Structures are given as C-alpha cells and as structure tokens.
Design an enzyme around this catalytic site. Structure first.
Site, mmCIF file in Angstrom:
data_model
loop_
_atom_site.group_PDB
_atom_site.id
_atom_site.type_symbol
_atom_site.label_atom_id
_atom_site.label_comp_id
_atom_site.label_asym_id
_atom_site.label_seq_id
_atom_site.Cartn_x
_atom_site.Cartn_y
_atom_site.Cartn_z
ATOM 1 N N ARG A 1 35.135 50.959 37.759
ATOM 2 C CA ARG A 1 34.997 51.257 39.202
ATOM 3 C C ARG A 1 33.572 51.403 39.741
ATOM 4 O O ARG A 1 33.392 51.403 40.947
ATOM 5 C CB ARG A 1 35.835 52.481 39.607
ATOM 6 C CG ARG A 1 37.334 52.182 39.647
ATOM 7 C CD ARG A 1 38.090 53.422 40.046
ATOM 8 N NE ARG A 1 38.257 54.343 38.909
ATOM 9 C CZ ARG A 1 38.702 55.585 39.024
ATOM 10 N NH1 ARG A 1 38.951 56.111 40.222
ATOM 11 N NH2 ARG A 1 38.868 56.319 37.929
ATOM 12 N N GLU B 1 39.653 45.331 25.191
ATOM 13 C CA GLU B 1 40.921 44.845 25.736
ATOM 14 C C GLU B 1 41.414 43.662 24.923
ATOM 15 O O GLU B 1 42.607 43.532 24.677
ATOM 16 C CB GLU B 1 40.783 44.434 27.190
ATOM 17 C CG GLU B 1 40.457 45.611 28.096
ATOM 18 C CD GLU B 1 40.324 45.144 29.528
ATOM 19 O OE1 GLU B 1 41.380 45.032 30.193
ATOM 20 O OE2 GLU B 1 39.190 44.855 29.979
ATOM 21 N N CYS C 1 41.181 52.798 36.114
ATOM 22 C CA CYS C 1 40.157 51.766 35.973
ATOM 23 C C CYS C 1 38.781 52.297 35.595
ATOM 24 O O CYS C 1 38.150 53.032 36.346
ATOM 25 C CB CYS C 1 40.073 50.839 37.224
ATOM 26 S SG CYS C 1 38.768 49.620 37.044
ATOM 27 N N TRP D 1 36.064 41.262 34.989
ATOM 28 C CA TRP D 1 35.667 40.690 33.692
ATOM 29 C C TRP D 1 36.126 41.666 32.616
ATOM 30 O O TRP D 1 36.389 42.817 32.918
ATOM 31 C CB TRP D 1 34.148 40.443 33.566
ATOM 32 C CG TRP D 1 33.237 41.612 33.934
ATOM 33 C CD1 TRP D 1 32.889 42.691 33.127
ATOM 34 C CD2 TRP D 1 32.576 41.825 35.191
ATOM 35 N NE1 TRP D 1 32.050 43.548 33.829
ATOM 36 C CE2 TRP D 1 31.844 43.038 35.087
ATOM 37 C CE3 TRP D 1 32.529 41.101 36.399
ATOM 38 C CZ2 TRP D 1 31.054 43.535 36.140
ATOM 39 C CZ3 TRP D 1 31.750 41.599 37.451
ATOM 40 C CH2 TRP D 1 31.026 42.807 37.310
HETATM 41 C C1 HEM Z 1 34.808 44.246 37.172
HETATM 42 C C2 HEM Z 1 35.117 44.565 35.905
HETATM 43 C C3 HEM Z 1 36.348 45.442 35.540
HETATM 44 C C4 HEM Z 1 36.501 46.051 34.358
HETATM 45 C C5 HEM Z 1 35.570 46.034 33.122
HETATM 46 C C6 HEM Z 1 37.740 46.773 34.371
HETATM 47 C C7 HEM Z 1 38.241 47.506 33.325
HETATM 48 C C8 HEM Z 1 39.567 47.946 33.267
HETATM 49 C C9 HEM Z 1 40.270 48.397 32.076
HETATM 50 C C10 HEM Z 1 39.683 48.394 30.648
HETATM 51 C C11 HEM Z 1 41.509 48.767 32.432
HETATM 52 C C12 HEM Z 1 42.622 49.338 31.509
HETATM 53 C C13 HEM Z 1 43.137 48.309 30.483
HETATM 54 C C14 HEM Z 1 43.628 49.015 29.232
HETATM 55 O O1 HEM Z 1 43.728 50.285 29.188
HETATM 56 O O2 HEM Z 1 43.931 48.283 28.248
HETATM 57 C C15 HEM Z 1 41.608 48.584 33.885
HETATM 58 C C16 HEM Z 1 42.710 48.886 34.673
HETATM 59 C C17 HEM Z 1 42.838 48.658 36.025
HETATM 60 N N1 HEM Z 1 41.851 48.165 36.894
HETATM 61 FE FE1 HEM Z 1 40.004 47.546 36.312
HETATM 62 N N2 HEM Z 1 38.299 46.653 35.621
HETATM 63 C C18 HEM Z 1 37.515 45.769 36.355
HETATM 64 C C19 HEM Z 1 37.792 45.299 37.639
HETATM 65 C C20 HEM Z 1 38.867 45.625 38.441
HETATM 66 C C21 HEM Z 1 39.153 45.105 39.781
HETATM 67 C C22 HEM Z 1 38.358 43.993 40.512
HETATM 68 C C23 HEM Z 1 40.232 45.736 40.234
HETATM 69 C C24 HEM Z 1 40.965 45.568 41.593
HETATM 70 C C25 HEM Z 1 40.328 45.099 42.691
HETATM 71 C C26 HEM Z 1 40.658 46.664 39.206
HETATM 72 C C27 HEM Z 1 41.726 47.533 39.282
HETATM 73 C C28 HEM Z 1 42.375 48.048 38.181
HETATM 74 C C29 HEM Z 1 43.715 48.592 38.198
HETATM 75 C C30 HEM Z 1 44.659 48.741 39.419
HETATM 76 C C31 HEM Z 1 44.022 49.008 36.796
HETATM 77 C C32 HEM Z 1 45.371 49.607 36.306
HETATM 78 C C33 HEM Z 1 46.222 48.359 35.980
HETATM 79 C C34 HEM Z 1 47.654 48.675 35.578
HETATM 80 O O3 HEM Z 1 48.188 49.770 35.932
HETATM 81 O O4 HEM Z 1 48.307 47.804 34.919
HETATM 82 N N3 HEM Z 1 39.793 46.616 38.143
HETATM 83 N N4 HEM Z 1 40.376 48.168 34.369
HETATM 84 C C1 LIG Z 2 54.484 49.036 31.967
HETATM 85 C C2 LIG Z 2 53.121 48.825 32.615
HETATM 86 C C3 LIG Z 2 52.682 49.646 33.661
HETATM 87 C C4 LIG Z 2 51.414 49.423 34.228
HETATM 88 N N1 LIG Z 2 50.944 50.183 35.245
HETATM 89 N N2 LIG Z 2 50.646 48.408 33.788
HETATM 90 C C5 LIG Z 2 51.039 47.606 32.765
HETATM 91 C C6 LIG Z 2 50.105 46.509 32.309
HETATM 92 C C7 LIG Z 2 48.869 47.125 31.618
HETATM 93 C C8 LIG Z 2 47.840 46.039 31.381
HETATM 94 C C9 LIG Z 2 47.961 45.221 30.253
HETATM 95 N N3 LIG Z 2 47.074 44.242 30.023
HETATM 96 C C10 LIG Z 2 46.043 44.032 30.879
HETATM 97 C C11 LIG Z 2 45.862 44.812 32.024
HETATM 98 C C12 LIG Z 2 44.678 44.496 32.923
HETATM 99 C C13 LIG Z 2 43.584 45.560 32.960
HETATM 100 C C14 LIG Z 2 42.360 44.948 33.623
HETATM 101 C C15 LIG Z 2 42.382 44.555 34.969
HETATM 102 C C16 LIG Z 2 41.229 43.971 35.536
HETATM 103 C C17 LIG Z 2 41.267 43.538 36.996
HETATM 104 C C18 LIG Z 2 40.084 43.790 34.762
HETATM 105 C C19 LIG Z 2 40.100 44.216 33.418
HETATM 106 N N4 LIG Z 2 39.014 44.060 32.600
HETATM 107 N N5 LIG Z 2 41.226 44.752 32.890
HETATM 108 C C20 LIG Z 2 46.777 45.835 32.295
HETATM 109 C C21 LIG Z 2 52.288 47.798 32.170
#
Ligand code: HEM
Ligand SMILES: Cc1cc(N)nc(CCc2cncc(CCc3cc(C)cc(N)n3)c2)c1
Ligand code: HEM
Ligand SMILES: Cc1cc(N)nc(CCc2cncc(CCc3cc(C)cc(N)n3)c2)c1
Ligand SMILES: Cc1cc(N)nc(CCc2cncc(CCc3cc(C)cc(N)n3)c2)c1
Ligand SMILES: Cc1cc(N)nc(CCc2cncc(CCc3cc(C)cc(N)n3)c2)c1
Ligand SMILES: [Cl-]
Ligand SMILES: [Cl-]
Ligand SMILES: [Zn+2]
Ligand SMILES: [Zn+2]
Ligand SMILES: [Zn+2]
Lengths: 407, 411
Positions: free
Chosen positions: B111, B285, B108, B280
C-alpha cells in the site's frame, strides 16, 4: 451456535461448539479486531466456584450426584464464612491441567494431560519457595529427558499477601548496559538484572549469566536465591557442517519455565505457579537469538558464511536464519536434551486440534502465536482457520511486580 | 477515542483515531476473535447516506468541504437517486474511489504505492467482446515490457443484480490444472474446477504444466464468453538459480503480472462487480505460496532431492533449506530478466514506513496481521512485532463468490 473452521490445504471443515462456554472477553468488537495486540468478593466468587465444580463433576461422570451436590454445598458454606475456599487435591490437579488445555497460545497442548502437579500450598516463606523451585527444576530437567511440571504456591487472599516469582522465567540470562552504549548479555533482562544488583546480587558481568531468583512470600519484600549451578542444564551450540559455528561462543539453557503468570481455578487466583515443558527449536534459534531486541546474531553468522550482505534480495538473512536453527536442533539432540522442531510440533498440534473438536467440541487457538516465526506456510497450522476465545481454568499475564510492590 | 498500538522490537507506540470512521463489521465479538477466518440491489433509503458519506470524504480530500460545488454535487446525486434509484460517479470521484479502496485494503502489504494507480474507466463497455479489448489493453499497459505499472479497469456498476459484469477468472493470468484418472494433477491444482468449465465452454486445452487459461467474460448478466489473451501480451520468466545449474531443468516458469479479477469494488454505495486490478509480485507469493503450498505445485520434495539434503527427519530442516533456495531463484530470475519484483524484506520495511506515515497524516492504517506477515521468515521482518488494528473502511474491495455457483444460465 455452530461456527465452522476450514483448513485451506485439505478442505476439511470442523464445527466448534465449545466457544459457547467462553466467559472472559477478547478485546475485539464488531467494529475492530485486536487479534494482533499482545495485551488486549463473596458474591462474585460462588458462581465462579460452581461453574468450575460443575465442569469437574461432569469430567468424572458424577454430575448431579450426591457427592457433586454435597461438595457444592460445602464450598458455598466455606465462602459465606471465610470469604474464600480451598480446592481438593483432585480439583487442583484437574484445574492446572485444564489451564494448559485452555491456553490458546500454546502449540504443545497435545501433552496437556501429562502434567506433573506439585502442590506447594503449604509453603510459608521465601526459603520454602526456593526449595520447591529447585526440586521442580531437577524433576523437570531429569538429566535431559524433560518432563512437564507445574508448582503451585498459596492462593491470593486479600491481595496484600501475594506469593510472586519476580523473574519472568525460572532460568534466564542477565543483561547489562555498557559504557559503549551497547548491551552485554540478554537485553530483555536489563531492568530485572539492575533490581537484582540493587538487592545485593554479585553479578559476573558476562554474556550468559543465569539470574538469581527473587522470591516474594506472603506479600513480603522479595529475597534473592541462586539456583544450584549443577541443576541448570545448558547446551553449547554447534553446527553439523560449519566447524566455525562453535567459535561464536553461543549456548542456551535446556529448561523453558514460565514464572510470571497467574493461574485462575474456580475463581481462586494462584499468583505464583511456575510451569515448564521443553523447547520448540525456533524459540531459541529465531526468537531468542535473532530478534533485533535480543541477542541479534544474524549479521555475525551471515559474515562467517561469506554471504552477499549488500542487498536484501540475496536472502542472506533467510539463509543464516535456517543455519542457526539447524545448529540449535543438532546441539540439543547431540547432548540428549529433549527438543521438538517446528514441523513436528505443528503436526502434533493439528492432530491434537482434531482430537479436541471430536471429543470436546473445539480447541481455542491464537493463530498469531501458534504459527512458528519462520517457514510458517510450510507447516500444517498456517492454512488452518482457528477460533480464539477464553476458557477457564486459565493462565493470565500479570505485570512485573516491581511496578506494583511497595518496599 | 484513542487506541494505541506498540512495536515490540522498537517500543514505538502509535495512536489510532481513524477506527472511529469504521462502519462495517469484522466478524469478531467481545467473546470470540475471528481474526484467522478467511471469509468471516440496494434500496434508495440506504444508498443516499452511503453516497453522502463518500462525497463528504471526497470533497474534504480536495479541500472543498462545504463549498458550493460540494453542496451542488450532493443535491445532484440526491435528485439522481430519488429519480433513477442509483447515480453515476464523476471521473474524478471514480479515480479517488479506486485509489482509496486500495489504501483501505487491510490485507495488502504493497500500500505504500496506493496513490500511484492508473485507472481505466470502462463504464461504457456493453459486451464481452468489449470487455476482452479493455482487458488486453490493461495487460499491455500494466506489463510495460517488464517495468510493471499498477492499474485497475472498472466495468459498469451493478443495477438490479440480474445484469452484472463479471470476470469469471480469479486472476487475469493463471495456469490451467487438469485432474488425471489416477488422481494426480497436471498443472496448477488451484484451477481444476475453472479449467473444466473452460473446456466445457469450448476451450481446446494444450494439457501441459503451464498453460495460460482463457478469459471467461460475462457482460450485462449474459452467459460468459471465452477469449484467449494474445500470447505475446503474456510476459513470463523461466526460473533459474544463481549457483545451482540444475535448477533450470526443473522446467519452472511463472508469469510476471499478478492481476486479481474476482473482487467487488464498493464506492459510495455503488458496486463494481468487475474491476480487475494488478501490481507486481512479492517474491514469496511465487516461491512460497504458488510453488510450495501442498495444494499447489508442491515442489519442495523435488528441489530437496536435487540438493541432496537429509530428508529422513524433519529436524534437519530440509524443507526450510529448500524453501530459501527456491525463493532466491525466483528473485534472481525476475531481476535478471528486468521484470519488477520486490523481496519480502524490502516490502515489509516499506510497509512499516507507509503505516507510520498513515498514522501521522490520517490517524490510522487498518491492517490484517495474518496476511501482512510474509509466509516465510516472518519474525525477521519489521511487521512481525508490529501490533495492528484490523477494521473496515470504505471505499473497499470485497470478496465475492465464484460466479459459476450463482449464475442463471440463459442457454
Ligand atoms: C504494487 C505492488 C503490490 C504488491 C507488492 C502487493 C502485495 C500484496 C500481497 C503480498 C498480498 C497478499 C497475498 C498473500 O498473502 O499471498 C496482497 C493482497 C491484496 N492487495 Fe496488494 N499488492 C500490490 C498492489 C495492489 C493493487 C494495485 C491493489 C488494488 C488496486 C491491491 C489490493 C490488494 C487487495 C484487495 C488484496 C487482498 C486480496 C484478497 O483478499 O484476495 N494490491 N497484496
Ligand atoms: C477464499 C479467498 C478469499 C480471499 N479474500 N482471497 C482469496 C485469494 C487470495 C489470493 C491468492 N493468490 C493471489 C492473490 C493476489 C494477491 C496480490 C494482488 C495484487 C494486486 C498484487 C500482488 N502482488 N498480490 C490473492 C481467496
Ligand atoms: C511440553 C512442551 C511444550 C511446548 C513445546 C510448548 C510450546 C509453546 C510455544 C512455542 C509457545 C509460544 C512461544 C512463542 O511464540 O515464542 C507456548 C506458549 C505458552 N504455553 Fe506452551 N509448550 C509446552 C508446554 C507447556 C506447559 C507445560 C504449559 C503449562 C502447564 C504451557 C502453557 C503455555 C502458555 C500459558 C503459553 C503462553 C505464554 C505467554 O503468554 O507468555 N505450555 N508454548
Ligand atoms: C508482553 C508479554 C505478554 C505475554 N502474554 N507473554 C509474554 C512473554 C512471551 C514469552 C517469551 N519467551 C518465552 C515464553 C515461554 C514460552 C514457552 C513456555 C513453555 C511452558 C514451554 C515452551 N516451549 N515455551 C513466553 C510477554
Ligand atoms: C515485556 C516485553 C517487552 C518487550 N519489548 N518484548 C518482549 C518480548 C516480545 C516477543 C517477541 N517475540 C516473540 C514473542 C513470543 C510471542 C509471539 C508473538 C507473536 C506476535 C508471534 C509468535 N509466534 N509468538 C514475544 C517482552
Ligand atoms: C478458493 C480457494 C480454495 C482453496 N482450497 N484455497 C485457496 C487459497 C487459500 C490460500 C492459501 N495460501 C495463501 C493464500 C493467500 C492469503 C494468505 C492467507 C494467510 C492465512 C496468510 C497469508 N500471509 N496470506 C490463500 C482458495
Ligand atoms: Cl519471535
Ligand atoms: Cl501461503
Ligand atoms: Zn478479532
Ligand atoms: Zn520475536
Ligand atoms: Zn498458502
């Protein structure tokens, strides 16, 4: 031990078995991944020689043959007597090609079997090294129709008689600290430039001064040589649409040639082994021109484009980046100097990777380096899972010799 | 034990000690790096150490380590586990736990915001109908008419693994996808399988390009039930370009609220299988991943056609040019409608400031370079030349397989 790799765009799954032949260690553990870290005797030598000769005799379908056993016998005796051994010319060529094949950070490996190998093991002096390098530069450059090549100087003996090219690349530009506090030329090369001046180089003190070679033969103090200017092909950079781009006064050299790496073959170590290919456009237009620690030209280009630079969300940096990379590709193509764009190069690498899985059981690859530094996700390598592991023969990084050498 | 990381643009070196607290495995070994692999009931015995580890961390964070309240809480949890085979978190511990799962999420980039998270405790939920109401309330709170607020809603924890709460949707808001007899796809191809399941369960599909999917919700291990989110709660942004007036006629729009609903939250050994969370968007994305991935809306060709770019050779960088303009349009559109969005330059700059702060105050910041670096213009962002260390800290968010593969249908 079968490991699966998936492509997330195509759903195609491949099975890697080649990793079971990996020997060197990665720096990662079960507790910590160091994937993004840039730098993560007789008794020892025979197993290494055997491992290599086994793979060589297997490659020419003569494994377990009389000629295989006889050669293993021969090398064993040579090591027991002389504490080292010499590679046959066939073995040297095979080893060098496989070092390239095994280079997990290289996107250009579709080309690996077409490498011209120049055997410079009879070289004894720094003047001899210079002649060999000039001939490499001329052969590889080929008036703009670039050809991959490697030149291999004598192997390490006791470690006190190393051949080394002090330069990181055969062709690179000088960098100079200014009274202003800024840097003229390439900031990557300020330290090396100073050493050159201290050793007697008469610096032109411009923005694009080709550095002299500092060549170390037989563990002796390095000596300075200038590559004949007419062998260094350069390209002036212009843009197909923007008439003003030429007025930036930018140019780059056509030949990418790494000279600071160590080639390990069958336990033997070649500390001077310069090799060269041709450029992928982003290497010049993204890395060399736009890295903050390099020529750092984004701001100047953006200014000429009349972009809104007041806010990051206008994406003015991204717009100027694209235009610089268009100009690099256009200029090289217009001057008939081989270059590959990042779309073509990555497409080729995926085809190569597929070939290697089917014919070899895998292809070690470092995703952090394979994915281009711009527009990553729109290239076919981004969604490709990769496994990174170390195979020999190999190219290894070695530190700058001025940190080790004693004059 | 110290590990050093270097920034290759600035020469700044940082030292990691936090990795010593890492527990779980990465997938990597001494012989192989799996850094680009996307996917690399507990017993009483294993649970109390996990509980104790968490409670020690919690009480340390409030400067009450070794206090009577700390010791009393350990005793209370110990007796709860030995008697009931599990335990319940205090509201304070749940909030701390959810914030830390976010702090620890190595993939993420957002963070810097981790301590600003609204936690909705839904552990009293018993039915799918109840889940739906909690989810609507989350969407409304988080959306806040465009001034987006980060939030998480936490449903009851796993018991025996036969009574799991699950949101079957991968995200709370996402668009339907429909495979056509000619092999083309209408809408979002990422969601074809889930859309078929919804239709089979009774959803009447509009069959358009941007149809908001219904929620499919599973309570207490029962078969899931379908609910439509009220349309007035789903904020959307039509996409237009500041200079190109034809961009609007591509008919593109996207939803404002990114909300992940398929992950598992682990706190002190307890497993929360339904814990939707939202923040947000970062512009890429939408503009890179959702619009330009070949397996998604795949709009690059159409955009490049309208720009009249030279599409005969890849070396004209037509794809790169079109990609920049699409991403400009996304940021412009959200900003014009006053919907929170962050560009990739701002987001990565903030992440690096967050990371440096974390090294100083916490001793580390685990980060996965592969996901942290944006999918366009990587090397011109300050994360590209930053070395990172990836390791697993708990509390954590974990991926879990889609429930349609594992669910025992009751009928
Ligand atoms: C507040 C604004 C936030 C922004 C801009 C943001 C941004 C992102 C981005 C860009 C990704 C990766 C998506 C990609 O590579 O296409 C991501 C992944 C992730 N974020 Fe955030 N995030 C935010 C909030 C949060 C919140 C509130 C949480 C949990 C409480 C969170 C937990 C995670 C987790 C667990 C992943 C990995 C998801 C997965 O494995 O599928 N994020 N974040
Ligand atoms: C196979 C697989 C594994 C894995 N760990 N995650 C995925 C989904 C990856 C994925 C795709 N589209 C969207 C997201 C969300 C990322 C995301 C999450 C939050 C909370 C905010 C933000 N701006 N962006 C994550 C797929
Ligand atoms: C033929 C055209 C070639 C192309 C297009 C090419 C492409 C590249 C690129 C783009 C990189 C990484 C640079 C970066 O990320 O900025 C690289 C690295 C590398 N390549 Fe190639 N390559 C070519 C030929 C060669 C040859 C001929 C060899 C050796 C015989 C070789 C061995 C290596 C090695 C060892 C690295 C890692 C270098 C390091 O660690 O500094 N490549 N290649
Ligand atoms: C600290 C450090 C470690 C390491 N392994 N490499 C480096 C240098 C990275 C580097 C920088 N510019 C240029 C290159 C050469 C890349 C390269 C090599 C060849 C043969 C062809 C081609 N197109 N490109 C490599 C630095
Ligand atoms: C000795 C040395 C010192 C220094 N401060 N920088 C360098 C160059 C570092 C460097 C910067 N950009 C690019 C590279 C090429 C290798 C490279 C690295 C990464 C992370 C991704 C990718 N696609 N390619 C290397 C070398
Ligand atoms: C279940 C599933 C199946 C499938 N075929 N694709 C996916 C999405 C895979 C996917 C594609 N692009 C982007 C992501 C987001 C995570 C992500 C992955 C990588 C490699 C880099 C980066 N910056 N971010 C994920 C999920
Ligand atoms: Cl770079
Ligand atoms: Cl993507
Ligand atoms: Zn690793
Ligand atoms: Zn760089
Ligand atoms: Zn993608």
């Amino acid at each position: 031990r079968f490991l699966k790799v998936k492509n997330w765009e195509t759903d195609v799954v491949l099975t890697d078995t080649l990793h079971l032949k990996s020997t060197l260690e990665t720096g990662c553990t079960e507790h910590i991944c160091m994937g993004s870290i840039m730098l993560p005797t007789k008794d020892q030598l025979f197993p290494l020689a055997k491992e290599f000769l086994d793979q060589y005799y297997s490659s020419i379908k003569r494994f377990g043959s009389k000629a295989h056993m006889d050669r293993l016998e021969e090398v064993n005796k040579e090591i027991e007597s002389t504490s080292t051994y010499q590679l046959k010319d066939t073995e040297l060529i095979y080893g060098a090609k496989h070092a390239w094949r095994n280079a997990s950070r290289c996107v250009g490996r579709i080309q690996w079997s077409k490498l011209q190998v120049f055997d410079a093991r009879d070289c004894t002096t720094a003047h001899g090294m210079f002649n060999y390098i000039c001939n490499h530069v001329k052969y590889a450059t080929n008036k703009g129709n670039l050809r991959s090549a490697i030149t291999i100087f004598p192997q390490r003996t006791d470690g006190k008689h190393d051949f080394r090219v002090w330069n990181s690349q055969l062709i690179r530009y000088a960098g100079y600290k200014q009274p202003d506090g800024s840097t003229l030329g390439d900031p990557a090369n300020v330290q090396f430039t100073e050493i050159c001046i201290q050793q007697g180089w008469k610096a032109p003190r411009g923005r694009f001064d080709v550095l002299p070679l500092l060549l170390q033969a037989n563990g002796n103090d390095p000596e300075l040589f200038q590559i004949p200017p007419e062998l260094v092909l350069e390209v002036p950079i212009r843009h197909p649409k923007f008439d003003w781009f030429k007025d930036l006064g930018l140019k780059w050299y056509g030949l990418p040639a790494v000279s600071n790496m160590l080639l390990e073959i069958g336990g033997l170590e070649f500390s001077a082994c310069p090799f060269s290919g041709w450029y992928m456009g982003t290497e010049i237009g993204v890395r060399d021109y736009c890295d903050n620690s390099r020529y750092n030209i984004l701001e100047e280009v953006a200014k000429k484009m009349d972009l809104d630079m007041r806010k990051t969300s206008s994406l003015w940096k991204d717009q100027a980046l694209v235009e610089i990379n268009i100009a690099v590709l256009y200029s090289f193509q217009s001057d008939k100097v081989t270059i590959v764009d990042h779309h073509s190069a990555t497409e080729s690498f995926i085809k190569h990777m597929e070939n290697e899985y089917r014919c070899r059981g895998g292809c070690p690859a470092d995703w952090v380096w394979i994915v281009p530094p711009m527009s990553g996700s729109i290239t076919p390598v981004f969604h490709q899972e990769m496994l990174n592991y170390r195979l020999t023969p190999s190219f290894e990084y070695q530190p700058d010799p001025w940190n080790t050498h004693v004059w």
